[PDB]
Amino acid sequence: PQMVMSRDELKLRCEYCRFEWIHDTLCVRCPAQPSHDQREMWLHSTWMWGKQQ
C-alpha cells in the first residue's frame, strides 16, 4: 500500500474507503479497488529498541 508521510496526507477516495487501525498505525482500507489502500508511515509492527530507535 502507498505510504503517505503523515496522517494529514491521508484521504478517502471511494465511497467504500474506511479508516482502520493496524496496531497504532492509522490506515485506509478499500474492500473494492485495493489500489486505494494507504499506510501512514511509522514503525514496523514488531520492533525492538536497539533495532528500531
Binding residues for other proteins, rule: CB under 8 A, are: 15-16, 20-21, 23-24, 31-33, 45-46
Say whether residue 27 binds Zn ion (CB under 5 A): no
Beta strand spans in the chain (E) = 2-4, 18-22, 25-29, 38-40
**52 touches 43 (CB < 8 A):** yes
**27: annotated binding-site residue?**
no
Rg (CA), the chain: 12
The residue among 12 and 31 lying less far from other proteins, judged by its C-beta, is 31
Number of residues that bind Zn ion (CB under 5 A): 5
The residue among 33 and 47 lying less far from Zn ion, judged by its C-beta, is 33
